[PDB]
Structure formats: C-alpha cells, structure tokens
Amino acid sequence: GDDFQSRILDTPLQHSDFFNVKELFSVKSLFEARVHLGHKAGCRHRFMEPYIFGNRLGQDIIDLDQTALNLQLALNFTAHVAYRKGIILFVSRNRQFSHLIETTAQACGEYAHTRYFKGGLLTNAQLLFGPSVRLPDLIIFLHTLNNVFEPHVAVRDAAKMNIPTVGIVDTNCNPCLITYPIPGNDDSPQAIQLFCKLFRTTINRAKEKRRQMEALHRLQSPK
Amino acid sequence: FAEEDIDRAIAYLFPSGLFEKRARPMMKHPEHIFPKQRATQWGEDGRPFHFLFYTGKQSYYSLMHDVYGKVMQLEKHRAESRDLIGSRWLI
Amino acid sequence: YEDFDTRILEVRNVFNMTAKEGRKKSVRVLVAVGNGNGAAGFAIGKAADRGDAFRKAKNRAIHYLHYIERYEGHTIFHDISLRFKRTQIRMKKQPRGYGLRCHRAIIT
Amino acid sequence: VESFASMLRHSPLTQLGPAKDKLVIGRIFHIVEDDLYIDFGGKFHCVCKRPDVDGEKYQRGTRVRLRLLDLELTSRFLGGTTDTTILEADAVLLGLQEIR
Amino acid sequence: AGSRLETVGSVFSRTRDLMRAGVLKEKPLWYDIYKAFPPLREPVFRRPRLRYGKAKADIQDIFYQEDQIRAKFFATYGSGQKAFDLFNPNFKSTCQRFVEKYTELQNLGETDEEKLFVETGKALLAEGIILRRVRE
Numbered sequence: 001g002d003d004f005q006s007r008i009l010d011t012p013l014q015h016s017d018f019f020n021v022k023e024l025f026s027v028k029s030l031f032e033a034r035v036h037l038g039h040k041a042g043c044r045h046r047f048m049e050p051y052i053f054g055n056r057l058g059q060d061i062i063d064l065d066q067t068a069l070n071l072q073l074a075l076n077f078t079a080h081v082a083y084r085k086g087i088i089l090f091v092s093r094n095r096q097f098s099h100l101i102e103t104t105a106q107a108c109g110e111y112a113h114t115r116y117f118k119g120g121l122l123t124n125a126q127l128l129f130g131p132s133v134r135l136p137d138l139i140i141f142l143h144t145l146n147n148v149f150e151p152h153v154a155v156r157d158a159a160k161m162n163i164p165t166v167g168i169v170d171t172n173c174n175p176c177l178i179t180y181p182i183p184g185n186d187d188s189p190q191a192i193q194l195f196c197k198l199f200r201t202t203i204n205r206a207k208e209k210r211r212q213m214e215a216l217h218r219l220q221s222p223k
Numbered sequence: 224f225a226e227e228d229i230d231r232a233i234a235y236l237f238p239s240g241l242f243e244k245r246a247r248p249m250m251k252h253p254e255h256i257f258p259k260q261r262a263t264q265w266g267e268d269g270r271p272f273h274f275l276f277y278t279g280k281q282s283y284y285s286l287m288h289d290v291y292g293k294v295m296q297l298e299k300h301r302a303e304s305r306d307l308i309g310s311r312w313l314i
Numbered sequence: 315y316e317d318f319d320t321r322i323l324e325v326r327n328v329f330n331m332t333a334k335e336g337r338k339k340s341v342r343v344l345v346a347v348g349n350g351n352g353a354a355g356f357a358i359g360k361a362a363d364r365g366d367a368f369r370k371a372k373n374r375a376i377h378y379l380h381y382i383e384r385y386e387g388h389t390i391f392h393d394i395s396l397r398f399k400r401t402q403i404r405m406k407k408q409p410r411g412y413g414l415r416c417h418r419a420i421i422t
Numbered sequence: 423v424e425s426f427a428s429m430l431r432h433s434p435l436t437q438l439g440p441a442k443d444k445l446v447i448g449r450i451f452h453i454v455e456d457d458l459y460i461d462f463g464g465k466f467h468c469v470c471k472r473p474d475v476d477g478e479k480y481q482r483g484t485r486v487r488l489r490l491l492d493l494e495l496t497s498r499f500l501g502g503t504t505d506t507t508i509l510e511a512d513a514v515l516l517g518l519q520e521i522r
Numbered sequence: 523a524g525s526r527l528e529t530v531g532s533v534f535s536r537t538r539d540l541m542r543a544g545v546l547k548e549k550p551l552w553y554d555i556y557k558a559f560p561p562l563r564e565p566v567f568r569r570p571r572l573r574y575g576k577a578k579a580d581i582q583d584i585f586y587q588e589d590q591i592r593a594k595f596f597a598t599y600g601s602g603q604k605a606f607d608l609f610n611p612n613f614k615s616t617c618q619r620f621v622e623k624y625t626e627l628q629n630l631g632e633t634d635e636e637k638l639f640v641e642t643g644k645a646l647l648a649e650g651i652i653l654r655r656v657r658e
C-alpha cells in the first residue's frame with residue numbers, strides 16, 4: 001500500500017536516466033536539423049555568448065555539445081514531470097509553427113497556447129478560469145520571444161508563479177529566467193520539428209512507463 | 224405532455240398581462256433558462272479536458288485549428304465555387 | 315494566514331484633480347507583513363477609502379514574501395551597508411541581548 | 423562518432439564561404455498567391471515572386487536555382503542597441519533546376 | 523501566499539524558502555525532480571548590461587585553413603557554374619574538389635602557392651571540370 005506508492009514515485013529519482021532519453025537524440029542528429037545556426041552577430045544577446053561556438057562570417061554558431069548536455073537535462077526533467085502526471089503547457093508565438101505545436105501537444109496528451117497571451121493568465125488565473133483552476137506544472141517554450149522581438153510574457157509570469165520552464169533559447173534570446181535552457185535554432189522548420197518530436201516521444205514514454213510501473217506494483221499486492 | 228402544453232398550462236393557471244413576456248411566469252427546461260456556458264471544464268484531478276483549455280477560447284481556437292488543417296491538406300494535395308447561392312455567413 | 319501580522323508604515327491622503335469632485339480623494343497605504351519566523355513582505359495599496367487601501371495592500375504583500383536569513387534566529391549574518399536611491403542604510407550584527415536599536419520603521 | 427567541430431568544418435554551409443552572389447538549389451515548400459517561399463538549406467527561407475514565364479511550373483516541391491545575397495536580412499537603426507531582423511533571407515530566383 | 527519576486531533568487535530557492543518559513547505545506551511535484559537533476563546553471567534573474575570602454579565579447583571567428591585556398595578560388599574563378607546543393611549532406615562542390623586536390627599536392631611537398639594553384643587547375647582540367655578564369 002504505502003510501500004507501493006513510495007516505490008512508484010521514489011524509485012524513478014534513483015537513476016540518472018530512468019527513461020533513457022539519451023538515445024532519442026545525438027549531436028549528429030541535432031546537426032542534421034540545423035540546430036547549430038544562430039542569428040547574425042548584431043542580434044546576439046549578451047547572456048547567450050557562453051553557448052556560442054563562434055562566429056562563422058557574421059552568423060553565430062551554437063555549440064552542439066552544450067546543447068546535448070542541456071537538452072539531456074531538459075528532456076529528463078520533462079519526463080519525470082510527465083511521469084508524475086503533471087500538466088505540461090507548450091507555448092510559442094511563432095505563427096509558422098502554430099499548427100505543428102498544437103498538433104504536438106494534442107499528440108502528447110498535453111496542452112498548447114500558441115495564441116495571444118492574455119495578461120494575468122497565470123498571475124490572475126482564478127478570475128479568468130474559475131476558483132479551483134489548476135495551473136500548469138511545467139511550461140515548455142519552443143519560442144521565448146513574441147512577434148515584437150520581446151520576451152514572451154509567460155517567461156516572467158511563470159517565474160512569478162514558481163513554475164519551471166523548459167525553453168529553446170536562440171542567440172538573440174534571454175535565457176536567464178529559463179529553468180532548463182536548450183540552446184539551439186528556433187527559426188528553421190527542421191529544428192522545430194525535431195524538438196517537437198523529442199518532447200512528444202519523451203512525454204509518451206514517461207506516461208507509458210507510469211502505467212507499467214503501476215501495473216507491476218499493483219499486481220504484487222494481490223500476488 | 225410537451226413543452227407546448229406546459230407553456231399553455233402555465234398561462235391558464237397563472238394569468239399575467241404584463242406586456243414584456245420575459246417577466247411572465249415560466250416553467251421551462253433548465254437548458255433554456257440557465258446559461259449554457261457554465262459547465263465544468265476539468266476533472267477531479269484538475270487536468271482540463273481540452274488541450275486548448277489554457278487559451279481561454281478553447282472552442283473558438285479548436286475550430287480555427289480544424290479549418291486551418293483542412294486548408295493545409297487542400298493546398299498540399301494540389302471548378303465553380305458557387306455550390307450554394309442566396310446564402311450568408313452566420314452572424 | 316493567522317500566523318502573519320500586518321503593520322502600517324505610511325498612510326498618505328493625497329488629492330488629485332478629477333471631475334468627480336473637482337479635486338478627487340486618494341489614500342495610499344504602505345504596509346508590511348511577516349510571521350516573525352523569517353518570512354516578510356511589503357506592498358502599497360491605493361484606494362479612495364482608507365479601509366480599502368488597507369485590504370489591497372495587506373493582501374498584495376502576502377504575494378511578495380521575502381525570506382530573510384537570520385544568524386541563530388536573532389540577528390543578521392554580517393554587517394550590511396547599502397544605498398537605495400538617496401537613502402543610506404547601515405546595519406550591524408550584534409550579540410544576544412543587544413536589542414533593536416534602529417529607526418522606528420526598521421524595528422517594526 | 424564524429425565530433426561537432428569536424429561536422430562544422432566539412433559542412434556544405436561551411437564550404438560555401440561567403441553567401442553573397444553564390445548559386446544554390448532551393449525547394450518551394452509554401453506558396454501564397456504569386457509569392458514563393460523557398461528553402462535553400464539555410465536558417466531562414468527566402469521569398470521570391472513567381473516568374474511570368476512558366477509560372478505554372480513553380481509548384482510546391484519544385485526544386486529551383488537561386489543566387490544568394492544574404493542569409494539573414496538585418497540592420498541596426500538609430501537609437502537601437504540590437505539589430506532589427508525580418509527573419510528572412512535574400513535571394514534572386516533564376517529558374518527551375520533541370521531534373522536530368 | 524507565495525513569492526512573486528522573480529528578480530531575487532530562483533523558483534527553486536523561493537520554493538525552498540517558503541517551506542522553511544512555514545507558508546508552503548506541501549512540496550510541489552516538480553520540486554524533488556529539480557533537487558535530483560538540477561540544471562547546469564541556477565535560473566536567477568540578471569539585468570542585461572551593455573559593454574563600455576574597451577570591454578569586448580569572446581567569440582572566435584571560425585576560419586579554417588581551407589579558407590585561404592577557398593578565397594583564392596572564388597577570386598579567380600568565382601563560384602562554380604554548378605549550383606550548390608545544401609540539402610545533400612555529402613555534397614562535393616567544384617570548389618571543394620579544388621581544395622581537396624590543392625591539399626593533395628601540398629602533401630607531396632610543393633611549397634610555392636603559385637605552383638599549387640596552377641597545377642590544381644590542370645589536374646581538374648584532366649578530370650573534365652570546366653573552370654573558367656573569369657576576371658569579370
């Protein structure tokens with residue numbers, strides 16, 4: 001009874017890669033998707049220079065070794081939250097990828113907000129949604145800037161509510177408030193599609209693992 | 224016994240001559256009187272039922288999601304368009 | 315939040331110029347809250363009635379709770395000197411039994 | 423396993439060198455009226471106009487030829503601490519690529 | 523009751539502190555996960571500042587040794603009349619073959635750049651590649 005619930009929820013945190021997310025991606029796979037391509041040097045944010053491999057004739061290049069380490073952490077974190085039945089909200093204001101991101105969230109079983117973000121959505125949720133609205137446990141920012149080249153309002157508002165944020169940060173983005181930044185290209189369709197696939201496979205694996213873990217421990221109780 | 228008979232019976236048993244008919248006695252089905260847009264949108268565990276719950280217009284954007292997906296398939300896959308005449312877009 | 319206490323720090327009665335009264339009335343209230351156990355916060359509430367300014371400030375401050383580190387639960391960990399705009403504060407760590415020898419607002 | 427540094431050195435984009443007045447092959451992925459959105463393998467796509475000659479030939483999936491000018495159109499304006507980008511590349515559509 | 527102060531500390535530190543004070547009675551579900559697999563950097567607010575005086579960034583210009591050869595090839599012959607295909611991961615352009623042959627000759631021990639530049643053109647001519655020395 002109590003032991004089984006402790007096993008379901010406490011065992012996953014004793015392994016470095018309980019969900020084996022390392023296999024999903026590779027430096028070679030990320031390089032195929034053009035995830036190492038950044039904006040011109042003029043568009044560079046000062047807090048992104050740690051992650052930039054260098055400047056190839058005006059175009060910042062993103063070190064794909066730091067991306068692999070950071071992406072490993074972000075995918076692992078996104079899996080444990082999904083394993084514990086937490087709510088995950090995908091957020092982006094890029095309109096080219098609005099339908100892809102809504103389709104991904106629906107496939108995962110999670111939520112997407114790719115539309116105009118209303119002020120107070122998270123800091124004033126009770127008024128907007130109802131008295132007992134449950135807020136997201138994790139917000140994944142496939143794009144961290146809005147269409148006026150400013151930080152998406154939900155980056156600051158998710159910190160105000162103490163919600164962790166897994167965000168894709170490009171050379172012009174500000175990663176300081178992103179809990180799990182993933183340095184990489186956000187503009188190319190091939191880069192966004194790879195990230196959407198990883199978050200969907202990762203979330204689906206963790207949800208399946210939870211079902212299997214519950215069946216095994218549950219079966220032991222009669223047996 | 225039907226909705227029509229109910230309204231007629233209430234008019235006999237509670238004769239009112241108020242000019243505005245919204246102010247007259249009524250024994251209607253709760254669906255008619257009560258605002259329809261007041262239904263629970265999440266379960267006991269607090270997880271919303273629709274993936275677009277956090278947009279605030281889950282039904283408007285769910286419809287705009289479907290029509291945008293149809294448009295993409297027609298554009299990718301590839302006559303007179305006046306199949307219907309004397310019609311208007313809904314207000 | 316029965317474990318939290320609220321204290322007032324400033325109450326301003328300021329008048330502006332709106333057509334409602336020609337010269338409108340306004341009450342700006344600065345309050346602070348704390349549980350006496352390391353968690354405290356402050357907020358400003360403004361309203362036309364003083365009682366409303368108290369409620370607005372009091373409930374706003376509960377959403378901005380700092381946690382203050384106390385050495386052994388009775389004093390700061392080290393001397394602190396700072397300038398916030400044109401106001402200089404200079405705090406000093408002291409032994410037990412010294413008490414609070416500070417500006418009346420700092421004691422509160 | 424090849425390292426990222428090796429991948430970058432031998433990458434087609436690294437071989438291109440400067441992208442001004444270079445020739446590249448692109449693919450049309452999106453068409454809106456007479457505007458063609460062409461992916462030439464870079465970070466940003468370009469947007470060209472359907473040529474008057476053989477307009478019907480330029481359909482989605484059609485591979486074309488281009489003359490790159492910039493990979494990203496960006497410029498700093500007075501009173502700005504960062505460059506203003508339109509998230510688009512500059513190229514001149516030359517015509518369809520012969521399938522051969 | 524919470525700490526909507528996103529300019530001091532981090533979501534984890536603010537959640538750790540609220541529990542120590544006694545305001546937050548139940549751990550969030552994401553808390554234990556962060557404790558075991560934290561990010562490389564702590565997510566704390568920092569105000570972006572500009573550089574002044576003689577401070578400069580630390581970004582290495584990416585220039586390989588082939589670029590010296592490639593620059594000469596573009597100046598002498600321009601871009602190869604064949605169009606680059608940046609969708610093929612193993613594409614070999616006319617310029618990339620020039621740099622492969624130029625390297626091979628340099629391995630033999632030729633030390634004169636002029637010798638390596640005119641000899642490579644002859645070798646590619648035998649291969650049949652059409653190199654036009656377009657000054658225009």
Ligand SMILES: [Mg+2]
Pocket residue numbers: 039170171185186187
């Ligand atoms: Mg970008």
